[PDB]
Amino acid sequence: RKPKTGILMLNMGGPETLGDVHDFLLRLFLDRDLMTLPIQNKLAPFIAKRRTPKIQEQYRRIGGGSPIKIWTSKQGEGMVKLLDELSPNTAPHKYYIGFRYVHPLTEEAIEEMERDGLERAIAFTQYPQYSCCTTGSSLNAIYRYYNQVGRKPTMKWSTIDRWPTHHLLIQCFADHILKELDHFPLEKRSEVVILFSAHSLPMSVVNRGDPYPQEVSATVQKVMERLEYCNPYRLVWQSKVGPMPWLGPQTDESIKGLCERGRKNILLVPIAFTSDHIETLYELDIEYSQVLAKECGVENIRRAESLNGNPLFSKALADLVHSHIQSNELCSKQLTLSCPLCVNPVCRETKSFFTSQQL
Amino acid sequence: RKPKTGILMLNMGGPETLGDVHDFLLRLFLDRDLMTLPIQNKLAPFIAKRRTPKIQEQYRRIGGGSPIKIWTSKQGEGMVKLLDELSPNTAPHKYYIGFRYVHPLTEEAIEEMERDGLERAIAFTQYPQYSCCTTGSSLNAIYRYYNQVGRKPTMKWSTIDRWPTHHLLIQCFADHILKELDHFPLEKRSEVVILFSAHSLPMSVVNRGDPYPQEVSATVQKVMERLEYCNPYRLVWQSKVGPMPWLGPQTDESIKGLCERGRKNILLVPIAFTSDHIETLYELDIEYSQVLAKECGVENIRRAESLNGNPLFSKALADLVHSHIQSNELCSKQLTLSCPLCVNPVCRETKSFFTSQQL
Ligand SMILES: C[C@H](CCC(=O)O)[C@H]1CC[C@H]2[C@@H]3[C@H](O)C[C@@H]4C[C@H](O)CC[C@]4(C)[C@H]3C[C@H](O)[C@]12C
Ligand SMILES: C[C@H](CCC(=O)O)[C@H]1CC[C@H]2[C@@H]3[C@H](O)C[C@@H]4C[C@H](O)CC[C@]4(C)[C@H]3C[C@H](O)[C@]12C
Numbered sequence: 001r002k003p004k005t006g007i008l009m010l011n012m013g014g015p016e017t018l019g020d021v022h023d024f025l026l027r028l029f030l031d032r033d034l035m036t037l038p039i040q041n042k043l044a045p046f047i048a049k050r051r052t053p054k055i056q057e058q059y060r061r062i063g064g065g066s067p068i069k070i071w072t073s074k075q076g077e078g079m080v081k082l083l084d085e086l087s088p089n090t091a092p093h094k095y096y097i098g099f100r101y102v103h104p105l106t107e108e109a110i111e112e113m114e115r116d117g118l119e120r121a122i123a124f125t126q127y128p129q130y131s132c133c134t135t136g137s138s139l140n141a142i143y144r145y146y147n148q149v150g151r152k153p154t155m156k157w158s159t160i161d162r163w164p165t166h167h168l169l170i171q172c173f174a175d176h177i178l179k180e181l182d183h184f185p186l187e188k189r190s191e192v193v194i195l196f197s198a199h200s201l202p203m204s205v206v207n208r209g210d211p212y213p214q215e216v217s218a219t220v221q222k223v224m225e226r227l228e229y230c231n232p233y234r235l236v237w238q239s240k241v242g243p244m245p246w247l248g249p250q251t252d253e254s255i256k257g258l259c260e261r262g263r264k265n266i267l268l269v270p271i272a273f274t275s276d277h278i279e280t281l282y283e284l285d286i287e288y289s290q291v292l293a294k295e296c297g298v299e300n301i302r303r304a305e306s307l308n309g310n311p312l313f314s315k316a317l318a319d320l321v322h323s324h325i326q327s328n329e330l331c332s333k334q335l336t337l338s339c340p341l342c343v344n345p346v347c348r349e350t351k352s353f354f355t356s357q358q359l
Numbered sequence: 360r361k362p363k364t365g366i367l368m369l370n371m372g373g374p375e376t377l378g379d380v381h382d383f384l385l386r387l388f389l390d391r392d393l394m395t396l397p398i399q400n401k402l403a404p405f406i407a408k409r410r411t412p413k414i415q416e417q418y419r420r421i422g423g424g425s426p427i428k429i430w431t432s433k434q435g436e437g438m439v440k441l442l443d444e445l446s447p448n449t450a451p452h453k454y455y456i457g458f459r460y461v462h463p464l465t466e467e468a469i470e471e472m473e474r475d476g477l478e479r480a481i482a483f484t485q486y487p488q489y490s491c492c493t494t495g496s497s498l499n500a501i502y503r504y505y506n507q508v509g510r511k512p513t514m515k516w517s518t519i520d521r522w523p524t525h526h527l528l529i530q531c532f533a534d535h536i537l538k539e540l541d542h543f544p545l546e547k548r549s550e551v552v553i554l555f556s557a558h559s560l561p562m563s564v565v566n567r568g569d570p571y572p573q574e575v576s577a578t579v580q581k582v583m584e585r586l587e588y589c590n591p592y593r594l595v596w597q598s599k600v601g602p603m604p605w606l607g608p609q610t611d612e613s614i615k616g617l618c619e620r621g622r623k624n625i626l627l628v629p630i631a632f633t634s635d636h637i638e639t640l641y642e643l644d645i646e647y648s649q650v651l652a653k654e655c656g657v658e659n660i661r662r663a664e665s666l667n668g669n670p671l672f673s674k675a676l677a678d679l680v681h682s683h684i685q686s687n688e689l690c691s692k693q694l695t696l697s698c699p700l701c702v703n704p705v706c707r708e709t710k711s712f713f714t715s716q717q718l
């Protein structure tokens with residue numbers, strides 16, 4: 001059968017091999033949405049060349065590349081299977097990966113979707129919580145594509161731009177959390193402190209009105225509720241770089257802070273991403289749970305498994321898409337509110353591309 | 360009949376008349392839980408005299424004092440009247456009022472509770488969302504009182520240290536929001552942008568692990584869920600002072616922001632406080648809705664009504680106590696975890712006081 005409904009799976013992406021590290025860094029130092037550099041066209045290829053070693057090196061310590069695409073693909077497969085069944089009237093579904101900064105790129109995927117003569121196209125962000133730096137950027141990419149290619153979509157577009165509190169999303173986290181608690185010694189289960197950890201944002205972004213911290217917080221509370229407040233928790237932020245202020249507490253400082261104060265049994269729960277990648281495998285597992293956590297209380301530090309293959313996550317993804325087609329919704333009500341301090345002319349145009357969509 | 364159960368209602372308080380302003384700020388600048396001033400004993404009485412006129416003037420713009428006590432009392436009476444029928448086994452109930460910085464002070468009320476030889480005392484913070492500067496500091500006061508009298512409690516103690524998502528609190532909010540939406544021109548309803556607003560914290564406090572932003576955020580989600588996402592929202596923060604950095608976005612900037620971006624129909628919704636005080640009558644209503652905003656794009660701004668005398672909030676209160684008495688809990692699990700970067704030696708002491716109570 002010819003595929004009816006396409007599900008564009010959006011995510012920043014990561015370098016698949018060490019060989020990709022360079023072009024990954026180049027595309028992100030060239031994206032004016034995240035960065036405004038002096039002579040950006042000269043500094044970008046330079047900064048990238050000068051930072052490639054260090055990053056190739058990080059991926060080295062995790063087996064030589066990002067698994068993001070592999071998990072995305074398995075997730076992709078499971079979702080489509082379920083959907084061809086959940087709504088037969090939406091015929092064959094097909095999933096497409098659109099990474100922002102590595103192949104297959106957003107622009108490359110939209111192109112293929114067009115060629116397959118699909119009638120319906122859903123931009124399905126893989127960040128459960130919206131930031132203008134993540135989902136927003138993916139969605140600008142779709143707007144800009146059609147602006148550049150200077151032709152209208154030959155297909156009917158809508159978006160799933162957020163989903164911080166989806167009931168099956170919440171369950172997968174809770175399931176993954178319990179079964180990690182079981183891996184701690186029973187003598188120390190109740191004493192376990194939970195740190196929910198997510199990628200920080202520069203304060204300048206926070207103070208502009210980014211929805212992310214508030215949504216990330218909602219995801220936390222929904223999971224603790226389902227867990228029946230069985231352990232104390234705290235939400236902390238990772239991945240800060242540079243001299244500028246970011247939203248804290250920093251995950252690292254928090255790990256050390258807890259140890260110094262007799263809280264030596266810590267569970268790391270990555271709450272803003274759905275699969276393994278550099279943030280989990282190098283940053284949390286190596287940088288913190290191995291090098292940092294020895295040098296402080298070497299009691300227990302574990303990390304909840306990323307949702308990765310979990311068949312329930314598959315069921316979650318499909319139920320979202322299905323529920324979204326059934327509702328005729330073009331985007332969240334939230335997408336219709338740019339942040340109150342926006343200084344990017346593009347978010348308006350992006351938002352209008354989605355709200356305006358035929359059908 | 361002999362009062363059996365005492366419910367200590369805790370709140371920072373505010374000046375009841377312009378004459379109570381000086382001693383309000385004095386007590387406040389003398390609290391080495393919120394401050395560390397050099398020669399604090401000398402600096403404080405001075406910073407008080409220094410700042411009394413302008414604050415007196417603020418109270419003047421809103422009638423001459425704080426209503427926080429009138430609403431507390433009403434809320435107390437309704438709560439008690441309901442508790443005597445829900446939990447008869449906890450005999451007659453009495454509510455007491457422990458304000459941190461105005462009469463009746465926490466220490467004053469604890470004294471009264473002793474003199475009535477209650478057999479049960481419940482510290483019921485009146486902040487639904489926990490901060491170490493709000494609830495923590497109330498709780499510190501209870502600890503310290505008993506510390507500084509070389510005596511133990513002659514009554515059984517516990518605390519309700521937070522309640523950011525109690526289902527009846529959520530309803531009250533939603534009702535006051537809906538009710539406020541019908542006061543908009545009917546044509547402009549779906550156009551209303553909602554700003555939930557909450558007293559901000561300085562980043563130094565956020566950055567050491569303060570549970571406040573995350574809980575406030577949980578409240579917002581739960582309210583929006585009850586409203587079925589009828590209008591777009593954004594959570595912003597008020598009451599910044601000094602040249603240091605605070606958690607944004609600022610409420611004032613956000614208002615001015617939306618207006619400049621064509622969003623002129625705003626519903627301001629206080630979400631971290633349960634009655635009228637300086638924040639709402641002065642900051643929101645006068646500084647922002649009147650002066651500000653009228654000097655940007657006009658076109659409607661309103662504030663949701665504070666829970667104040669809503670009989671439903673009175674049920675929320677009792678519902679909470681009744682549940683807490685029956686659960687036989689001493690404190691939230693959350694309380695048994697201090698800030699990962701705490702530097703205050705009293706937080707550990709205060710935590711232990713509650714977790715260590717006989718029962
Ligand atoms: C890869 C690089 C690390 C810097 C270094 O070489 O030392 C970091 C520094 C800042 C990062 C960016 C910023 O953290 C802001 C964004 C955060 C999002 O969660 C992912 C994309 C996002 C756009 C980041 C991409 C990438 O991980 C960047 C560019
Ligand atoms: C521009 C952006 C903040 C966006 C904003 O102001 O809204 C800032 C915050 C932290 C910055 C990054 C960090 O300073 C670390 C890197 C330092 C290099 O000299 C440039 C790239 C580099 C990866 C930075 C690029 C960019 O200036 C970032 C990502």
Ligand SMILES: C[C@H](CCC(=O)O)[C@H]1CC[C@H]2[C@@H]3[C@H](O)C[C@@H]4C[C@H](O)CC[C@]4(C)[C@H]3C[C@H](O)[C@]12C
Pocket residue numbers: 384387392393394492559560561564598600
């Ligand atoms: C945000 C901060 C909490 C203290 C802390 O985080 O350490 C709050 C709690 C009580 C506040 C004070 C009180 O609300 C009373 C005063 C209110 C005025 O508008 C500013 C100064 C003023 C004296 C406040 C300064 C500051 O915003 C305080 C100190």
Ligand SMILES: C[C@H](CCC(=O)O)[C@H]1CC[C@H]2[C@@H]3[C@H](O)C[C@@H]4C[C@H](O)CC[C@]4(C)[C@H]3C[C@H](O)[C@]12C
Pocket residue numbers: 395396397402406
């Ligand atoms: C250094 C200290 C901040 C404490 C800290 O964050 O480390 C600041 C904040 C409050 C300041 C004081 C108060 O603002 C009151 C006085 C006001 C004058 O403008 C300066 C002297 C004055 C007596 C201040 C001295 C000093 O700059 C203080 C004490």
Ligand SMILES: C[C@H](CCC(=O)O)[C@H]1CC[C@H]2[C@@H]3[C@H](O)C[C@@H]4C[C@H](O)CC[C@]4(C)[C@H]3C[C@H](O)[C@]12C
Pocket residue numbers: 388393394395406409410561600601603
């Ligand atoms: C005295 C001074 C204002 C001077 C004046 O109006 O004359 C007040 C107003 C803002 C206050 C400061 C702000 O609250 C910000 C600082 C952070 C904490 O609240 C404690 C110290 C802190 C540094 C405060 C101390 C002092 O009470 C300040 C500096």
Ligand code: FES
Pocket residue numbers: 132136208209210337338339342343344347
């Ligand atoms: S930056 Fe968030 S909408 Fe433009």
Ligand code: FES
Pocket residue numbers: 491495568569697698701702703706
């Ligand atoms: S500051 Fe939060 S516990 Fe001491």
